[PDB]
Amino acid sequence: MLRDGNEGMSTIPGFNQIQFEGFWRFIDQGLTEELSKFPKMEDTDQEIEFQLFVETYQLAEPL
Amino acid sequence: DDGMDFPYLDPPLICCFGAVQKEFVPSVRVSEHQMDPDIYSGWKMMQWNPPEFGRAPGGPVSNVAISH
């Protein structure tokens, strides 16, 4: 994703875009690209199975 | 109209006839490039690269008189 592209090219950009953009990129993509790396671990007895659906994650409003 | 006694002052006067206006740009055409309809913070990028008719845009006659 990209905001107004002409930021830093027409005005002095805010001295926050490093941390802000890093956190937004993390929330947008790192969660997806790390949840997919979660395996399909299970038991050797062929009796149980655990699955983590990836394209269903969401966050909650802080209490 | 003939009323005068002494000769005129050293710098010759200039006659400026027209309309008195504030920050007016008469010459307007269709510029090829536009820079966002809402964000005016980036419109200054059109002053580094003028549309070839607003390169040296003249204005009202009051501006010319003041500059003179």
UniProtKB/Swiss-Prot annotation, chain A:
<comment type="similarity">
    <text>Belongs to the RNA polymerase beta chain family.</text>
</comment>
<comment type="function">
    <text>DNA-dependent RNA polymerase catalyzes the transcription of DNA into RNA using the four ribonucleoside triphosphates as substrates.</text>
</comment>
<comment type="subunit">
    <text>In plastids the minimal PEP RNA polymerase catalytic core is composed of four subunits: alpha, beta, beta', and beta''. When a (nuclear-encoded) sigma factor is associated with the core the holoenzyme is formed, which can initiate transcription.</text>
</comment>
<protein>
    <recommendedName>
        <fullName>DNA-directed RNA polymerase subunit beta</fullName>
    </recommendedName>
</protein>
